[PDB]
C-alpha cells in the first residue's frame, strides 16, 4: 500500500509496465484485493453503486441541459416531421469554413440527435427549454444526493452490516412494491396529470397541478368504484396531438393500436398499462416474510421444490445458500434477465412505438434498435462470464450435493454435445440453403431457390389477427371466442394496426425472414455453446482437471499435453464476444434492411434479394454505403463527413485489433528488448531513464486489447453506416 | 472550537501563526490540499485581484493617452487588447514573472517553502516591515479586493454600467 | 446559444488543459 496499485502488493512489486496495466485492469475485482473481507467487499460495492447511479443522473442532466441550451426542442415541437432535433453545438477549431457551413443547422453549428430524446420528452409532456433545463438542475441535485449517500455509507457508523446485505426477503418486497410498483404508480401520476393534458394542449406544470384535476369527475369515481368513468370519451381518431382539437377526457383506456397522427401508443393506454403494472408489483412485493410474521421464506420455497420421483435429485436444496453467498451468481442472473429485458425493449419499441412521431424518425428507430441489441448482447455475454466466475470462485460441490446446479456439471458433456449438434445442424443447413440460393441465382435460375415459407411464424401472426396469410385462427377468426371476448376492448384498434402494412407491427414475413431467423438461431446457439462450455468446463476438463486452481483468467497451461492456449473460462468469454458481435450483426443487419425496404416502399427488394447472400452484400451493404463514403470527396464535404471519417476510423480500429489477436507476445518482447538496448546506447537519449521496465503486453492482456479494438471498430463501423445510410437515404 | 464558526471543530492543518487565520474552512479544503499551496494561492489571487480592482478604478477618469479609444467595460476591453496583441505580451510577461519569482518550482508537486513562509517571494525593494501583522493587513486587503473585483465585473455584466456610477442613485 | 463564449473556454479546458493535468497527476501517482 506504498506504490500503485495499493490493493495488490504482487502487482506493486512488479518492476515492469505490466504493474500499471494490471493495476487498472484489476482495480474493480475487489474480491482479489489484498486483505479484502466479505463485509468490506459488500460495503465497497454498495458505495461504488452510488457513484454509478450519480453518473447516470449527471449524463441524463447533460442531455437535458445541452438540448435546453443549444438544441431546437421548441422549433422541433412546432414541426416534428420536417425539423431535425439537435444534440448539441460543435466547437471544433480544426473545422474549415466548408465544414462550419456543412454542420450549420439554422444559425448554429450542431450535431443532429438520433437518441429519440425529443420524441420521448415531447410524449411525456415537456414543451419548452426552461422545463428541460429544470429537469437538468433537478437531476444534478439527484446526482449530488447519490454522491452524498455513497459517501455516507462508507463512513464507519453508516457502513451496513453483511446480514443487512443478505436480507433477500426484505430487498425483494421493497424492490417489487417500491422500486418497480410505486415508481410505476408515480409514473402513472405523471402521464395522467402532465403528459395526457400536454397531449390535449392543456398546460399542467408545478405552477398549477394542485388546482387542475386530470379528469372532470375527480377522484369520486375511484372511491365509489365507478371506474368506467375514466375510460369514457377517449381522444378521437381525428385528435391533433398537443392540441384540444378532437381531444377526449379519458385518462385510462384500452384502445389498442396507434394514435393515427403520431403513429405511437395512446398515452391513456400507457397510463392504464402502468396502473395495472404498479398494482401487480405492489401486490407481488407482499410475498416474502420480513418483520411482521406473514409471507414466504425463499429457502422454504426452494427446499420444497424437489420432485418426489428423484429425477432432480435433491432439487433446489442448497440453492438458497449458494445464490445468497455468491455475488457472481447474483450478477449472472441479473445480467441474464436485464439482457432479455433490453432485447424485449428493442423488439417491442420498434413494433409498438411508444413515442409521438418517432416511427417517422427512421435514423432514430434504426439507432435505438441497434444500440439496445448491442447492449443486450454485451449483457448476456457478461451474465455467462459471471456464471463461469461463480463456478470457479463461489461454487462449493459439498454444499450443492445432488441439487439442480451440481446435476448440470454431472451431465455437462450431454449439454455441450447437444449444443454442438444444434449449432452444427443450423450452420450446415442455413449456410447450405443460402449457398444453394446464391449458386442457382448466380446461374440465372432464382425459381430453383429453396424458399421455405416461415409458416409457423405466419400462423402466429394470424393468431394475433393478421388476415394476410389466409389463416382464420383465433383473433384472425371472426367466430373465435378469443375474438368476441376482446371485440369491445382493444381488438378493433389492434386489428387495424396489425392489418396495416405501412407500420412495423408484425411485419409481413416470407422466405427471406425464414433463412435469417435460422441464422439468428445459429448465432444464439453457438454463442450459448461457447459461454456454457466456458461455464461448465470453468472448474476443469480432461485437458486441465485442476483448472479451478488457476482461476477465471490465466494465459494457458503451456505447450504440454498437446498445447493449452485459450483453456481458461475467460478465454471462452473472449471467443463468445466474437460470436455475440457476429450474431447481433445478423440481427441488426436484418432489422435495418427489412426497415429500409419498408420505409422506401420497396418491400419486394428485401423479399427477392434477402434469400441469397450476394443480395445482402450488393443491395444492403454496397448500395447503402454511397451517401456515407461521399460524406467527403474531392468535390467537397457535407454533414455526413463525420460519419464517413468515423467509418474509416472504425475500420482502422477493427484492423488494429487483428494485430493483437493474431500476433502473440514472444514476437513483441524480443523486439522491445532491442528498443531498450538502442535507447540505453543512444547519446543524449540515454540520460533519460524509464522507471518501469518496458515489456510486451501479457498473453491475456493482448486478447483483451485485441478484443476491445475489434469490438470498438465493429460497433463504430456499423453506427456510422446505420446512421449515414438511413440519414443519406431519407 | 473554530474561532470563526464555534459549532464546527477547528481545521487541524490551519494554525494561528498563518496570516488572516480565523480557523475558517467549513469545506476542509486544507485537508484536501497542502496549506502552504492554498496560503500561496490565497495571497496571489489577492495580489492579482488588488491590481485588477485598481485597474478598473484608474481606467475610468483616464485611460492612458496612447491606448485612447478603447471601451473600459471588462469583456469589450478584453476583446480589444487581445485583437491589438497587448494581452499576449502581458500573458508571456506574467508567465516570465511566475517562473522568475518561484525560481522554476511552479507545480503543486514541485513548489517548496525551505526558508520562505507562503507569500514571501523576496520582493521588498523599499524594505518595509514584513514579519509582523502586516501580512494580516495584506490578506484582509487581498480578500476584500477578490470580493471587490467580483462585485465590479458582475456589475459591469448586469446593466453595462461603470464601477463609480453604480454608487450615485440607481436601482433596476 | 446565450453564453456562446463558454465553448471557447471549456472545450480547451476539458480537451487540452485538464487532460494534461490528469496525465501529469496520474504519471506522478503511478510513479511514486
Amino acid at each position: 500500500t506504498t506504490k500503485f496499485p495499493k490493493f495488490s502488493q504482487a502487482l506493486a512489486s512488479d518492476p515492469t509496465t505490466r504493474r500499471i496495466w494490471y493495476g487498472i485492469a484489476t482495480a474493480h475485482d475487489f474480491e482479489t484485493h489484498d486483505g479484502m473481507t466479505e463485509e468490506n467487499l459488500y460495503q465497497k460495492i454498495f458505495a461504488s453503486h452510488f457513484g454509478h447511479l450519480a453518473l447516470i443522473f449527471l449524463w441524463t442532466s447533460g442531455n437535458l441541459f445541452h438540448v435546453a441550451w443549444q438544441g431546437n426542442f421548441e422549433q422541433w415541437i412546432a414541426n416534428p416531421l420536417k425539423t431535425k432535433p439537435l444534440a448539441h453545438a460543435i466547437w471544433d477549431p480544426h473545422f474549415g469554413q466548408a465544414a462550419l457551413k456543412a454542420f450549420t443547422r439554422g444559425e448554429t453549428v450542431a450535431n443532429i440527435s438520433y437518441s429519440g430524446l425529443y420524441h420521448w420528452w415531447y410524449t411525456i409532456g415537456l414543451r419548452n427549454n426552461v422545463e428541460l433545463y429544470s429537469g437538468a438542475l433537478g437531476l444534478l441535485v439527484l446526482s449530488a444526493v447519490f454522491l452524498l449517500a455513497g459517501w455516507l455509507h462508507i463512513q464507519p457508523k453508516f457502513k451496513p452490516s453483511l446480514s443487512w446485505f443478505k436480507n433477500n426477503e426484505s430487498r425483494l418486497n421493497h424492490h417489487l412494491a417500491g422500486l418497480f410498483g410505486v415508481s410505476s404508480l408515480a409514473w402513472t401520476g405523471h402521464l395522467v396529470h402532465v403528459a395526457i393534458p400536454a397531449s390535449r394542449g392543456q398546460h399542467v406544470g408545478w405552477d398549477n397541478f394542485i388546482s387542475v384535476a386530470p379528469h372532470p369527475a375527480g377522484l369520486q369515481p375511484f372511491f365509489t368504484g365507478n371506474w368506467s368513468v375514466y375510460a369514457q370519451s377517449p381522444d378521437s381518431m381525428q385528435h391533433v396531438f398537443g392540441t384540444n382539437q378532437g381531444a377526449g377526457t379519458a385518462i385510462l383506456t384500452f384502445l389498442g393500436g396507434f394514435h393515427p397522427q403520431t403513429q405511437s401508443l395512446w398515452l391513456t393506454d400507457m397510463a392504464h398499462h402502468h396502473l395495472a403494472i404498479a398494482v401487480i408489483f405492489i401486490v407481488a412485493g407482499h410475498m416474502y416474510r420480513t418483520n411482521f410474521g406473514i409471507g414466504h421464506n425463499l429457502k422454504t420455497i426452494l427446499e420444497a421444490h424437489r420432485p418426489p420421483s428423484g429425477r432432480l435429485g435433491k432439487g433446489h436444496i442448497g440453492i438458497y445458500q449458494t445464490l445468497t453467498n455468491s455475488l457472481h451468481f447474483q450478477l449472472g442472473l441479473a445480467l441474464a434477465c436485464l439482457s432479455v429485458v433490453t432485447s424485449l425493449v428493442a423488439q417491442h419499441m420498434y413494433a409498438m412505438p411508444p413515442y409521438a412521431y418517432m416511427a417517422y424518425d427512421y435514423v432514430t428507430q434504426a439507432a435505438l434498435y441497434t444500440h439496445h441489441q448491442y447492449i443486450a448482447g454485451l449483457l448476456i455475454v457478461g451474465a455467462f462470464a459471471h456464471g463461469a466466475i461463480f463456478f470457479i470462485r463461489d461454487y462449493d460441490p459439498e454444499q450443492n450435493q445432488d441439487n439442480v446446479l451440481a446435476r448440470m456439471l454431472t451431465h455437462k458433456e450431454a449439454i455441450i454435445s447437444h449444443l454442438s449438434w444444434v449449432s452444427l445442424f443450423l450452420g450446415f443447413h442455413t449456410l447450405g440453403l443460402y449457398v444453394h440460393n446464391d449458386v442457382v441465382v448466380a446461374f440465372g435460375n432464382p425459381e430453383k431457390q429453396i424458399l421455405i415459407e416461415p409458416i409457423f411464424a405466419q400462423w402466429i401472426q394470424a393468431t394475433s389477427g393478421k388476415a394476410l396469410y389466409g389463416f382464420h385462427v383465433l383473433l384472425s377468426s371472426s367466430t373465435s371466442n378469443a375474438t368476441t371476448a376482446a371485440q369491445q376492448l382493444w381488438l378493433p384498434g389492434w386489428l387495424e394496426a396489425i392489418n396495416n402494412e405501412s407500420n412495423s407491427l408484425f411485419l409481413t414475413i416470407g422466405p427471406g425472414d425464414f433463412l435469417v431467423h435460422h441464422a439468428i438461431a445459429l448465432g444464439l446457439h453457438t454463442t450459448t455453446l461457447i459461454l456454457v462450455k466456458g461455464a461448465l468446463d470453468a472448474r476443469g476438463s480432461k485437458l486441465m482437471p485442476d483448472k479451478k486452481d488457476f482461476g477465471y483468467s490465466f494465459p494457458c497451461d503451456g505447450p504440454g499435453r498437446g498445447g493449452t492456449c485459450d483453456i481458461s473460462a475467460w478465454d471462452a468469454f473472449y471467443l463468445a464476444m466474437f460470436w455475440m458481435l457476429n450474431t447481433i450483426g445478423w440481427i441488426t443487419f436484418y432489422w435495418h434492411w427489412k426497415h429500409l425496404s419498408l420505409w422506401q416502399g420497396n418491400v419486394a427488394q428485401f423479399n427477392e434479394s434477402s434469400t441469397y447472400l450476394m443480395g445482402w452484400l450488393r443491395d444492403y451493404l454496397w448500395l447503402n454505403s454511397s451517401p456515407l463514403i461521399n460524406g467527403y470527396n474531392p468535390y467537397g464535404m457535407n454533414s455526413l463527413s463525420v460519419w464517413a471519417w468515423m467509418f474509416l476510423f472504425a475500420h482502422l480500429v477493427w484492423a488494429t485489433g487483428f494485430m493483437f489477436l493474431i500476433s502473440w507476445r514472444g514476437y513483441w518482447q524480443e523486439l522491445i528488448e532491442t528498443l531498450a538496448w538502442a535507447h540505453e546506447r543512444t547519446p543524449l537519449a540515454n540520460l533519460i531513464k524509464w522507471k518501469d521496465k518496458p515489456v510486451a503486453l501479457s498473453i491475456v492482456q493482448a486478447r483483451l486489447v485485441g478484443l476491445v479494438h475489434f469490438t470498438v471498430g465493429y460497433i463504430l463501423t456499423y453506427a456510422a453506416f446505420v446512421i449515414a445510410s438511413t440519414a443519406g437515404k431519407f | 472550537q473554530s474561532p470563526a464558526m464555534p459549532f464546527l471543530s477547528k481545521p487541524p492543518n490551519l494554525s494561528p501563526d498563518m496570516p488572516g487565520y480565523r480557523g475558517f474552512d467549513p469545506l476542509r479544503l486544507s485537508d484536501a490540499f497542502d496549506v502552504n499551496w492554498l496560503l500561496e494561492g490565497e495571497v496571489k489571487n489577492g495580489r492579482v485581484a488588488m491590481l485588477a480592482c485598481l485597474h478598473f478604478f484608474v481606467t475610468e477618469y483616464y485611460q492612458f493617452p496612447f491606448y485612447a479609444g478603447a471601451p473600459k467595460l471588462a469583456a469589450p476591453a478584453h476583446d480589444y487588447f487581445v485583437k491589438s496583441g497587448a494581452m499576449i505580451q502581458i500573458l508571456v510577461f506574467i508567465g516570465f514573472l511566475e517562473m522568475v519569482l518561484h525560481r522554476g518550482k511552479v507545480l503543486y508537486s514541485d513548489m517548496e517553502w525551505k526558508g520562505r513562509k507562503p507569500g514571501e517571494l523576496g520582493f521588498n525593494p523599499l524594505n518595509l516591515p514584513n514579519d509582523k501583522a502586516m501580512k494580516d493587513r495584506e490578506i484582509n486587503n487581498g480578500r476584500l479586493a477578490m470580493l471587490g473585483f467580483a462585485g465590479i465585473i458582475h456589475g459591469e455584466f448586469l446593466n453595462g454600467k461603470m464601477p463609480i456610477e453604480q454608487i450615485t442613485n440607481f436601482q433596476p | 446559444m446565450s453564453a456562446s463564449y463558454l465553448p471557447s473556454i471549456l472545450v480547451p479546458t476539458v480537451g487540452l488543459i485538464l487532460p494534461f493535468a490528469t496525465m501529469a497527476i496520474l504519471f506522478v501517482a503511478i510513479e511514486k
Binding site: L137, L140, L147, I154 | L27, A32 | A3
Partner: peptide, 28 residues
C-alpha cells in the same frame, strides 16, 4: 431560451457534484 444566469447556475451545481464526487472518490 436559457439565460446566461441559468447556464452559470447549472455550472455551480455541477461544481457541487464535482466537490461531492471527489469526496466519494477519495474515500472509496
Amino acid at each position: 431560451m436559457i439565460t446566461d444566469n441559468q447556464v452559470f447556475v447549472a455550472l455551480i451545481m455541477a461544481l457541487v457534484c464535482g466537490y461531492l464526487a471527489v469526496k466519494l472518490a477519495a474515500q472509496l
